[PDB]
Amino acid sequence: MGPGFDFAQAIMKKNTVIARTEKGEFTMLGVYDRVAVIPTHASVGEIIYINDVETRVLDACALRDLTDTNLEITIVKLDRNQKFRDIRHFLPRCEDDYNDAVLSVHTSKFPNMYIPVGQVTNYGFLNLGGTPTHRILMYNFPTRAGQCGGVVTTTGKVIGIHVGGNGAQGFAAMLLHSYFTD
């Protein structure tokens, strides 16, 4: 409908796949080469389904900060025959608050879904499903089951992936440029 949705759509159309684990279907953001991200509660194993195709996982790393606190981001390298468009230059370098964000989801349950979530707070610490978690972004939208892995964008930045909600607020794990240096 406007330039926020334009940027979100451009990311969804080229840089997302549907990932299926034994824990469900997730929006999965491809970042560069064969490297993607998914919430850690997806419990990625040795094999994953990517757009309903059996795919070997070459590497999977559940990120933690240097206090050894959960970040809820898993970085996955996929044995796929095709690279992602490199979007690392759209990743923020530092922790920040944002205005006018969009949460975008693409699954069998929720195809081509876009939600204007408005203002995003650097919330920081969250007890997420009983697990102490850091670098959490918060938005005041009543997000539901099926939105995990959803991409949070502003115009020109890819800032997080949706990891939970409490019925009134939604929570995303930050994406930082430093996670994807090679």
Swiss-Prot record:
This is Protease 3C. It comes from Human enterovirus D68 (EV68). It catalyses: Selective cleavage of Gln-|-Gly bond in the poliovirus polyprotein. In other picornavirus reactions Glu may be substituted for Gln, and Ser or Thr for Gly. Interacts with host IFIH1/MDA5; this interaction inhibits host IFIH1. Major viral protease that mediates proteolytic processing of the polyprotein. Cleaves host EIF5B, contributing to host translation shutoff. Also cleaves host PABPC1, contributing to host translation shutoff. Binds and inhibits host IFIH1/MDA5, thereby inhibiting the type-I IFN production and the establishment of the antiviral state. Cleaves host MAP3K7/TAK1, resulting in inhibition of TRAF6-triggered NF-kappa-B induction. Cleaves host TICAM1; this interaction allows the virus to disrupt host TLR3 signaling. Cleaves host IRF7, resulting in inhibition of type-I IFN production. The active site is at 41 (for protease 3c activity), 72 (for protease 3c activity), 148 (for protease 3c activity). The chain holds residues 1549 to 1729 of 2188 of the full protein. Residues 2-180 form the Peptidase C3 domain. It is found in: Host cytoplasm.
